[PDB]
């Protein structure tokens, strides 16, 4: 209940969260190979970038995916991106999974339990979906915030119809373990700091997984 407020956000943080979760393109590729992982020639025909630089945190996390068949799903940014070919490189935090023995026979549609001021509301089953056994929290989070902004105007200002002032996204697993992200706890105001919550390549099993969402207009 002690969540961060929308009114306490920095100068351009709200507008940049809207870009990341609603407008900006996502780096989505299957079966590709490459503290960082450089995907040279990732973009084809793009006017800004050629390469994709993926940050995994440390060398130990990189060795797990370095030189092996890999799946990508994450938010990329160009501003303040360090590394690769200068001015022609896009950056990404995590969103890495091993390709082999990870594909699902039938697409799993992650159910959403949405609460607005304590009152439970319905979300269509097709909003958050994946074809992966072990999914990065980024993949599910990117889809869930896209729906929230499209339906409730999550990252729009109060003047623009954004009623939600407080929010919590809980990725509840079958055992009882939870991955919790405060919808308004923004690290800085730009995607280089904002997307750092995905630095730790947090992977969770899609089997018997549901998303618990708690929104507050107050």
């Amino acid at each position, epitope marked *: 209940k002690d969540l961060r407020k929308k009114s306490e956000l920095q*100068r*351009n943080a709200l*507008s*940049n969260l*809207r*870009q*990341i979760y609603y*407008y*900006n*393109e996502k780096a989505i590729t299957e079966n590709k190979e490459s503290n960082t992982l450089l995907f040279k020639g990732f973009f084809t025909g793009h*006017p*800004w970038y050629n390469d994709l630089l993926v940050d995994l945190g440390s060398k130990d996390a990189t060795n797990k995916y370095k030189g092996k068949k890999v799946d990508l799903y994450g938010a990329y*940014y*160009g*501003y*303040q991106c360090a590394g690769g070919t200068p*001015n022609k490189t896009a950056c990404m935090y995590g969103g890495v999974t091993l390709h082999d023995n990870n594909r699902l026979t039938e697409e799993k549609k992650v159910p959403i339990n949405l609460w607005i001021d304590g009152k439970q509301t319905t979300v269509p089953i097709d909003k958050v979906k994946t074809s992966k056994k072990e999914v990065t929290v980024q993949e599910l989070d990117l889809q869930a915030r896209h729906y929230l902004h499209g339906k409730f105007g999550l990252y*729009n*200002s*109060d*003047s*623009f119809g954004g009623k939600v002032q407080r929010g919590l996204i809980v990725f509840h697993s079958s055992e009882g373990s939870t991955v919790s992200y405060d919808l308004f706890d923004a690290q800085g105001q*730009y*995607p280089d700091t904002l997307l750092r919550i995905y630095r730790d390549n947090k992977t969770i099993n899609s089997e018997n997984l549901h998303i618990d969402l708690y929104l507050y207009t107050t």
Partner: T-cell receptor
Framework: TGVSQNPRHKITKRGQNVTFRCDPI?????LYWYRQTLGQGPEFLTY????????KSRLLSDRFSAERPKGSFSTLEIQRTEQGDSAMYLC??????????FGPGTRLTVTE | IQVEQSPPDLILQEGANSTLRCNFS?????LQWFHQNPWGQLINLFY???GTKQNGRLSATTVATERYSLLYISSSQTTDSGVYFC?????????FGTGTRLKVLA
């Protein structure tokens, strides 16, 4: 120049909403928005570098919202329009920022 | 920061030379000269944070130490009539001057 702006002219009632589009030069990573009142020079509103919004002035109030809806353009929305909003809305792009290349602009008139 | 253009209005005869001044308050990394036609289109003349540049009939000189830039128009034609602007980088956030309205007579 290679920078396009739509519409060229727009007339709206006081209190209504208005949206302007800016199509920059594809190779340019930076996008700028300016407001130009009759007689005066262009005043800085906001600016983007790649996907990120970098700066926002005091003139770009809560009634104003700028975004890059992916990926070859940008929009500028003004809610609950005042007669004081009646100005030339210019859009510029640059591959630095070094040399800013300006569009033709959107001429807005807010009538009672 | 602040940027002032001198003179505010200029009445010139055809074929005669003219000089437009631009004064800025702080150090500048990027300086640009523009020309605005009656339609409102801003035409790029020079990108000159320092030194000397020449583009045919037009030339520009920026003295970065004394915080000023000058725009020279040799053999002023009726086509050159309009509003000339000087814009400065606040170090990014660009600030345009008051402007100079050129009235080239026939």
């Amino acid at each position: 120049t290679g920078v396009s702006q739509n519409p060229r002219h727009k007339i709206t009632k006081r209190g209504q909403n208005v949206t302007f589009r800016c199509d920059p030069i594809s190779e340019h990573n930076r996008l700028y928005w300016y407001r130009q009142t009759l007689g005066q020079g262009p005043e800085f509103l906001t600016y983007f570098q790649n996907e990120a919004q970098l700066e926002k002035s005091r003139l770009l109030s809560d009634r104003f919202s700028a975004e890059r809806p992916k990926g070859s353009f940008s929009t500028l929305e003004i809610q609950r329009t005042e007669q004081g909003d009646s100005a030339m809305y210019l859009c510029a792009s640059s591959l630095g920022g070094y040399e800013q290349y300006f569009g033709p602009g959107t001429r807005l008139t807010v009538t009672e | 920061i602040q940027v002032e253009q001198s003179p505010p209005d200029l009445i010139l005869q055809e074929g005669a030379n003219s000089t437009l001044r631009c004064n800025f308050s702080d150090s500048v990394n990027n300086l640009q000269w523009f020309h605005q036609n009656p339609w409102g289109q801003l035409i790029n003349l020079f990108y000159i944070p320092s030194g000397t540049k020449q583009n045919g009939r037009l030339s520009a000189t920026t003295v970065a130490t004394e915080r000023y830039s000058l725009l020279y128009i040799s053999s002023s034609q009726t086509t050159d009539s309009g509003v000339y602007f000087c814009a400065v980088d606040s170090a990014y956030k660009y600030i345009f001057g008051t402007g100079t309205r050129l009235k080239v007579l026939a």
